[PDB]
Design a binder for this molecule. Structure first.
Ligand SMILES: Cc1cc2c(cc1C)N(C[C@H](O)[C@H](O)[C@H](O)COP(=O)(O)OP(=O)(O)OC[C@H]1O[C@@H](n3cnc4c(N)ncnc43)[C@H](O)[C@@H]1O)c1[nH]c(=O)[nH]c(=O)c1N2
Ligand SMILES: Cc1cc2nc3c(=O)[nH]c(=O)nc-3n(C[C@H](O)[C@H](O)[C@H](O)COP(=O)(O)OP(=O)(O)OC[C@H]3O[C@@H](n4cnc5c(N)ncnc54)[C@H](O)[C@@H]3O)c2cc1C
Ligand SMILES: [N+]
Ligand SMILES: [N+]
Lengths: 365, 363
C-alpha cells in the first residue's frame, strides 16, 4: 500500500509526486498514455524536441516559480514572437506597431492610435455578439484580418453567433516590439520538457498505458490518499453530464528541409485555411539540423471521449462543475488538481503555483 | 428420497450430517468445492497438513465442545504465539509484557501500565474513527507499530477513514506471556482437520464439485428437508442485494528448507508489505521434515461472487440480513446455519455449539 496514488503524470501530478517522495512518502503514479508529462510532453524526433500537444512556452512574473523549475532544467532565451498569415498577407503578433504599420501604412504611435480609436468607436452600443465585441476592442481592420477567421475556426461558428464574453480584452501596444509575453522570465527548457518529468518521477512507481477509471476500486485500495489530475466529471462517471470542452488535432510532419516557416508559431487567420496554427518545433531551441518537424493544429469538434483541450467555462458548465466539486468536498482523502481536475485553463506557471500550494498544505513530516 | 439435503460440507454441515446419519437419517451432501471440510480444510502437501484457507487454531472454554471434537481426533498442545514484523522491527503478540518491554525499553508491569494509560488519554471524546478507537484503547505506539498498517491493508484506506466499530476491544495483559488465547482448551488436531470431516461424513452420500444453486433443478425433491450452509442471500437469488464481505487470497509456496520463519503465524503490520500474514503450516504440528510450505495471506477485494471470508456486519448489512432472515422464517422445510447461512463470523467452537443446538431441536 502506498501513501499516495497519483492519477496523471502531468505537471500537477509530477510536482506533487516529486515533493511527496522527497519527504519520504511513497507514490504510485497511474498514467493512461504511453508516456509521462501530460500535455507538456515533448518527443525527440529527428533530434528535435517536439511539443506533441501544442506549443508550450514557459513564462512567469514569479521568481520563486522560475527558480523552482530551474531545479530540473536550464531555460534558453527563446522569445515568442508569432506570425499571423491572412490570405496573401502577413503580420506580426502581438498587436503592436509592427502590426499597425503593415496594416495601414503608418509610422508613428499617434497615427496608429488615431486609427485604432476611430475604428473601435463605430460600436456605439454594448456589443450583442463576439463580432461587435472584438470590433469595439480593436476596430474592424484588426478584427477581420487577425481575429475573425481564427476565432470562427476555434469555435466552429460565426462570431455573430458567438457571445461577447469569449473575448474580454485585446491588448494593444504602441511600440515596435514583437514580444508576445510581457513576463520578465520566459524560455524553453533545454533538452525538452519530458526530461523534467523524468527527474520529478524518479522516486515514484509509474504505471503507463493504464486508465485508472477502468480499475477504479483496485487502485483506490492501493493507497491511503488519492490525487486525481484527470477529468473530475469522468471520475464520477459523468453522472451529471460531461463538462464541455473545445478540442484540437495535431498533424505532425517530418520535412526534408532545414527551415519551413522561419519562426516557431504561425497563426493562420483566414477561415478558409483549415488549420489554426503551424508549429515549427526546432525554433523553440534554435535548432541547427537539415530537417524539420512541423505540426498543423486543427480544430476538432469535441464530445465526451475526445481529448479535452480548452474548457468552455460558461455559466451552465460552471454550475455543472460545482455539482461535481461538491461531491469531491465530501469524499475524504481524494483530491482533485490540475487543469482537468479543476475544470480550468492553467498556464504552466499557474499549475506550478497551484501544485506547490497543495504540497505546502498536504505534505508535513 | 433422502431425509436431508445438506448444502455444504463445512463444520456445520458435517456435524449435522454425522448426527443425522447416526440417528438413522439418510443424508445427501452437496459441496461446490473439490473437497470437504469447508474453510477448515487441510491438504497434505509434502507430509505437512496445510491450512488452505488460513490458520485454524481450535480453542474453547466449554469442556463439552472440546470433548465432542475429541471423538473424531486427538488435539496436540500447540500454543498460538504470533510474531509481528513492522519494517525492520519485530514484536510478540498478543499485547503483553514481551511486547511492551521491546516497544519502550521498560521491564516492570507498572512501567508499562503507566505508558499505556498515559498514551490512551490523548483521546478525551468518543472515538470518531478507527484510529481514535485503537489509540483510546492501547495508545499511539502500540497502534502505529502493530495495528495501523495491518488494518490499512485489510480495508484499503486510512484508519481515520474507518468507523470505530471495526475494533471492539484490544486486550492488554501485564504478564510476560505470549499465549494468544486465554482458553483452557486449545490445540491442533493430529493428522489435520480433513480427517475429522472424513469421519463425520462417512455415513452420508457426498457430491463434490457441484454448486447447488447453479443446479437447483437437478436436486428438486431429492430430499425432505434442506440444511443450507451457503450464503443466505444467494439462496434467495439476492432479492434484496448482496451481503458484503471482505475476502482473502492465499499464495501457497513450497521451499526447500526445514524452517522458514520459526513460528506458525507471522503478522506483517506495516502497510508497505502487501501480505498481512505468512503462515508456516508445519509448526502447527511441530513438523520435522526437510521442506516447508508457507502461505502469503493477501487481502482481496470482494465483489458479489468472490469468496466470502469476513462479514462486514455494519448497520446497512445487518438490515439486509434481517430481510433474508425474515424470508427464512417462512421457508418451510429449509433451514439455514453456519457462518454463511447466518452472516456471522463464527469461531469453530461457536459452530460446534450452534450445530449441536440445531441437532438438538431437529433430531
Ligand atoms: C493547446 C494548449 C497549449 C498550451 C497549453 C494548454 C493547451 C490546451 N498550456 C497549459 C499546459 O498544458 C497545462 O498547464 C498543463 O497541461 C497542466 O498540467 P496538468 O497536470 O494540470 O494536466 P495535464 O492534462 O497535463 O496532465 C494530466 C495527465 O493526467 C492523465 N490522465 C487523465 N485521465 C486519466 C486516467 N483516467 N487515468 C490515468 N491517467 C489519466 C493524462 O493522460 C495526463 O497525462 C500552456 N501553458 C504555458 O504556461 N505556456 C504555453 O505555451 C502553453 N500551451
Ligand atoms: C481466514 C479465517 C481464519 C479462521 N481461523 C479460525 C481459527 O484460528 N479458529 C477458529 O475456531 N475459527 C477460525 N475461523 C473460523 C472458521 O473457519 C469457521 O468457524 C468455519 O468455517 C465455519 O464452518 P461453516 O460450515 O459454518 O462454514 P464453511 O466452513 O465455509 O462451510 C461451508 C461450505 O458450504 C459450501 N457452499 C457454499 N455455497 C455452496 C453452494 N451454493 N453449493 C454447495 N456448497 C456450497 C462451501 O463450499 C463450504 O464448503 C477462521 C475463519 C477464516 C475465514
Ligand atoms: N489514519
Ligand atoms: N506502516
Amino acid at each position: 500500500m502506498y501513501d499516495y496514488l497519483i492519477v496523471g503524470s502531468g505537471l500537477f501530478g509530477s510536482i506533487f509526486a516529486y515533493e511527496a517522495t522527497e519527504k519520504g512518502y511513497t507514490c504510485l503514479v497511474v498514467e493512461q498514455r504511453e508516456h509521462i508529462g501530460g500535455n507538456c510532453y515533448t518527443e525527440n524526433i529527428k533530434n528535435i524536441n517536439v511539443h506533441k500537444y501544442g506549443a508550450h512556452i514557459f513564462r512567469t512574473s514569479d521568481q520563486n516559480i522560475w527558480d523552482y523549475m530551474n531545479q530540473f532544467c536550464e531555460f534558453n532565451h527563446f522569445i515568442n514572437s508569432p506570425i499571423a498569415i491572412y490570405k496573401d498577407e502577413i503580420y506580426n503578433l502581438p498587436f503592436n506597431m509592427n502590426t499597425f504599420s503593415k496594416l495601414w501604412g503608418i509610422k508613428t504611435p499617434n497615427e496608429a492610435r488615431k486609427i485604432i480609436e476611430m475604428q473601435k468607436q463605430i460600436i456605439q452600443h454594448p456589443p450583442k455578439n463576439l463580432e461587435e465585441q472584438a470590433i469595439s476592442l480593436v476596430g474592424t481592420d484588426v478584427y477581420e484580418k487577425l481575429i475573425k477567421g481564427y476565432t470562427e475556426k476555434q469555435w466552429g461558428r460565426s462570431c455573430k453567433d458567438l457571445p461577447a464574453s469569449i473575448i474580454r480584452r485585446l491588448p494593444v501596444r504602441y511600440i515596435y516590439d514583437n514580444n508576445y509575453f510581457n513576463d520578465p522570465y520566459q524560455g524553453i527548457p533545454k533538452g525538452g520538457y519530458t526530461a523534467i518529468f523524468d527527474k520529478m518521477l524518479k522516486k515514484s512507481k509509474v504505471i503507463l498505458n493504464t486508465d485508472f477509471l477502468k480499475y477504479k476500486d483496485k487502485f483506490k485500495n492501493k493507497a491511503k490518499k488519492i490525487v486525481f489530475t484527470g477529468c473530475i466529471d469522468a471520475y464520477y462517471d459523468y453522472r451529471y453530464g460531461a463538462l464541455e470542452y473545445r478540442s484540437l488535432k495535431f498533424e505532425h510532419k517530418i520535412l526534408n528541409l532545414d527551415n519551413f516557416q522561419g519562426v516557431a508559431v504561425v497563426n493562420y487567420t483566414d477561415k478558409e485555411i483549415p488549420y489554426t496554427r503551424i508549429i515549427e518545433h526546432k525554433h523553440f531551441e534554435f535548432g541547427n539540423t537539415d530537417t524539420t518537424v512541423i505540426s498543423e493544429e486543427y480544430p476538432l469538434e469535441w464530445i465526451k471521449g475526445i481529448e479535452p483541450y480548452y474548457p468552455i467555462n460558461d455559466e451552465k458548465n460552471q454550475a455543472l462543475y460545482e455539482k461535481y466539486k461538491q461531491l469531491a468536498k465530501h469524499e475524504s482523502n481524494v483530491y482533485f488538481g490540475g487543469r482537468l481536475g479543476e475544470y480550468r485553463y492553467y498556464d504552466m506557471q499557474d499549475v506550478v503555483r497551484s501544485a506547490l500550494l497543495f504540497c505546502k498544505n498536504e505534505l508535513k513530516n
